[PDB]
């Protein structure tokens, strides 16, 4: 009496997928306030 | 003075064992939304 889910993997699996590339597309934008915080940390201790 | 009534217990014992033939044909059908009303609960509730 089942109710194929196959459908529900193959959806959803490609859903995880995608968060993790839109999770490594914000770390590559949060090391750019990383940085620049403490090169201007240099700057001032000049 | 009888009347032969011999036909009538060898005709509705074979028409109550017909009854419970489709009734088992009905609770099979049943279980299926018995089974997707339950699955679709996981689904709204992830």
Redesign the interface.
Known sequence: ???D?SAVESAITDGQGDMKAIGGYIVGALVILAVAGLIYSMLRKA
Chains 1, 2 share one sequence.
Request: proline fraction near 0%; aromatic fraction near 0%.
């Open positions: 009496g089942v109710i889910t």
